[PDB]
């Protein structure tokens, strides 16, 4: 257990949806934005090389890549879908990336009370035995070292 070390960093994933005042000519009823961001006062660009959002195949160019912040996709649509999201790290050792499956919903299952929706998903990422450089990238992004796993 001489050089065991575990680093935990937090990512915030989320989306906002609004019913349009007029549906588009294609019949899009909603404007949405999906994002990956750091917690308050945390720059995840230190450890994040790129984020890839995999949109539904109805959307044009469905593989959306943001190599720089802001890590977000903004589009208009008529239905919610499962959007795979890849967060690629600034490292040369595994884990190179983490893949999330995000539920972009235009309304919450139970009721449609208002025209505006906000959802937030905090995800804590755990790295065991990080290399020196990636640890410092992680620590600079607000990460902390915890009990070694």
């Amino acid at each position: 257990m001489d050089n065991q070390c575990t680093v935990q960093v937090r990512l915030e994933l989320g989306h906002r949806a609004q019913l349009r005042k007029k549906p588009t000519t294609e019949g899009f009823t909603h404007d949405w934005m999906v994002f990956v961001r750091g917690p308050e006062q945390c720059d995840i660009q230190h450890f994040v090389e790129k984020v890839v959002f995999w949109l539904h195949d109805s959307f044009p160019k469905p593989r959306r890549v943001c190599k720089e912040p802001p890590y977000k996709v903004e589009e208009s649509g008529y239905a919610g879908f499962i959007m795979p999201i890849e967060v690629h790290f600034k490292n040369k050792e595994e884990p190179r990336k983490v893949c999330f499956t995000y539920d972009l919903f235009l309304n919450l299952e139970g009721n449609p009370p208002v025209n505006h929706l906000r959802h937030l998903r905090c995800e804590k990422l755990t790295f065991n035995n990080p290399t020196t450089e990636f640890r410092y990238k992680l620590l600079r992004a607000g990460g902390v070292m915890v009990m070694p796993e």
């Binding site: 239905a79 879908f81 919903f105 235009l106 309304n107």
Partner: peptide, 4 residues
């Protein structure tokens, strides 16, 4: 709401 619709889903696809």
């Amino acid at each position: 709401a619709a889903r696809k």
